[PDB]
Every structure is written in structure tokens, then in C-alpha cells.
């Protein structure tokens, strides 16, 4: 329903884009992007602009045999969402927000998404990396896993 996307990265983008303005904690709704939408020097928001979320798949999607039939793979997919902002508290709110948003659909039986399960499974703080002299982006992230039965056409 809400996504029906061909690939997991677009699926998570669609879920984050579908979120009402009221569900984001900050005043301005974040911009959602594929990690490769922006070049590295440009990466992160400018001042006086909404925060940016970058979505990509960081590790190998597993395909497991479900049964001797071979009709479907038990497919397990992995994603990371990175929040970039100049505000060290805004990234923290965005981490909370992303977890909240993607904590809908937790046991979606392929109603909203093409998956049985979309879940936040871990989170990272990287604020310790931002050097204090310069203004520069604070970064935090949500790790997302995603599971469903994926058809093989083995038996037509």
C-alpha cells in the first residue's frame, strides 16, 4: 500500500517520506535522500535548511531457502539511516523520530510494505567525532533490518 517499492533502500525512503509533519519532533520536516544523491563536500544540510537523512544498504542481503519447494527465499535485508544536522540535539530528536516512524510496520504482514517485518535493530551516536572548534555536522544513525518471503519463479 504505502510503498510497494522494488528495493529495500527505496522502501525505507518511502516510509520516511510518508511520515506526517506532526510526527517529526523538530519544527521543519527532514529531507530524505539516497546516500548517493549528494557529493561528499556538499553532504549534510546548509544553515537555514531542514536536516537531511541519508539511506543506503551497508551489508549483504541474505537469501535463505524456505523449504524443499523452492517457491520463495526467506530474504533478510539490512539498511542504515544517517541523520545529519548542525544541532547536536536535533540529531538526537531525529534518532528518536526515525525509530518511532519505523516502529510502525514492525509486523506488517505485507499490508503497507512488501515485507513481513521492518524493524530498527540498533542505533549509533557519532557526536563524539565532530571537532568542537569548527561548525560541522553532528551525525547519528539508525540500523534497520527487513524480512520477507521473496518469489523464485522456480515452479512458474
Amino acid at each position: 500500500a504505502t510503498t510497494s517499492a522494488s528495493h529495500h533502500v527505496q522502501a525505507i525512503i518511502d516510509l520516511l517520506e510518508a511520515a506526517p509533519d506532526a510526527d517529526w519532533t523538530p519544527t521543519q520536516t527532514p529531507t530524505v535522500k539516497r546516500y548517493w544523491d549528494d557529493a561528499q563536500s556538499e553532504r549534510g544540510p546548509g544553515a537555514d535548511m531542514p536536516a537531511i537523512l541519508y539511506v543506503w544498504s551497508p551489508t549483504t542481503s541474505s537469501l535463505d531457502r524456505f523449504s524443499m519447494d523452492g517457491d520463495v527465499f526467506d530474504q533478510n535485508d539490512s539498511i542504515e539511516v544517517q541523520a545529519w544536522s548542525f544541532d547536536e540535539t536535533e540529531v538526537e530528536q531525529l534518532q528518536g523520530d526515525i525509530v518511532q516512524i519505523l516502529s510502525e510496520y514492525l509486523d506488517d504482514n505485507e499490508v503497507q510494505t512488501p515485507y513481513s517485518d521492518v524493524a530498527p535493530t540498533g542505533t549509533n551516536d557519532f557526536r563524539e567525532q565532530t571537532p568542537a572548534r569548527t561548525t560541522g555536522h553532528y551525525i547519528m544513525s539508525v540500523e534497520v533490518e527487513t524480512r520477507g518471503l521473496s518469489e523464485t519463479a522456480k515452479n512458474a
Partner: protein, 156 residues
């Protein structure tokens, strides 16, 4: 006929009801649920043949196994109280509390919605405390129901 399909465990909604009312008894936080209709079988063999002459079924019961991790005070007080009552202490009476049980589970593609309903489930023993240091409490119920009252596709 309806095509066989995989089922995501977390899609299942389990509920308990007082059979006097069909009113819900609050229960939550399941981690395992097994429901198994069973009969005793008896097989006829005679000097006529090495092969089975006949087979028949008797002593119907529905085995119910549940693992869960959210404690319900109502469920415990119902179990103590026996039919049509709640108690804060063990009751010196012969009637076990009989629960109606229902589990409703959408299939992985939404191709059917399995409803399983079991009458008069009783539990010989109830865990009240199940602590292990550095963990949340987890509880196991083993019980037996009289019969399956319903097993159907309840979609549409």
C-alpha cells in the same frame, strides 16, 4: 482450495476469554504459542495379517503451550479464583478456571486469515515468579483444551 502459505509468527493476535461472559481476560507479551489438537489412537492387529486391521481415535484434547514475558495480574487472579471468580489467594475447591482461547493470524501474503479457537483450556500449574538475575521475567504455561471450536479462513 486455498493455497498453502508461510506464516510470520508475530502476526498472530492471541486472546483469552471468560466462558461465562465471552469477556476478555487481559494477557500479553507472548514469545512462543503452540496449539496441538490430539487424540489417542488404538490399532487392531490379529493372527490373520501382519498389517493393521483397523485404527480408531479417542480421548480428544488440545495441547496448549505458551511462553510469555508480560505478567498479567488478572490472568493469575482468574486462575486462582476458579470459574466465574477472582482470588488473591489459593482456593480450596475442585473446579479449575476454564479459559476460552482464540488466536487470529494473517498469512504471509494475506492470502488467508487463520482463526483458531479452543474451548475450556485449563492449566495444571501457573508460574507467578520466574526471575533470573540480569534478565526480564519469562513464564511458561502448559495446558489442555476440550476441543477446537473453530479453524477457518476468516478473511473477507
Amino acid at each position: 482450495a486455498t493455497s498453502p502459505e508461510g506464516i510470520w509468527s508475530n502476526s498472530g493476535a492471541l486472546t483469552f476469554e471468560d466462558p461465562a461472559d465471552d469477556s476478555e481476560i487481559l494477557f500479553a507479551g507472548v514469545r512462543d504459542v503452540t496449539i496441538t489438537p490430539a487424540y489417542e489412537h488404538a490399532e487392531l492387529y490379529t493372527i490373520d495379517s501382519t498389517f493393521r486391521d483397523e485404527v480408531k481415535r479417542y480421548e480428544h484434547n488440545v495441547n496448549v503451550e505458551i511462553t510469555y514475558a508480560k505478567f498479567s495480574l488478572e490472568f493469575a487472579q482468574e486462575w486462582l479464583g476458579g470459574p466465574g471468580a477472582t482470588a488473591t489467594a489459593s482456593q480450596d475447591d475442585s473446579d479449575p478456571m476454564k479459559f476460552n482461547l482464540e488466536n487470529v493470524t494473517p498469512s504471509a501474503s494475506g492470502g488467508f486469515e487463520r482463526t483458531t479457537a479452543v474451548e475450556n483450556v485449563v492449566f495444571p500449574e501457573l508460574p507467578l515468579d520466574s526471575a533470573t538475575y540480569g534478565e526480564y521475567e519469562e513464564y511458561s504455561l502448559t495446558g489442555s483444551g476440550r476441543s477446537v471450536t473453530n479453524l477457518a479462513d476468516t478473511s473477507g
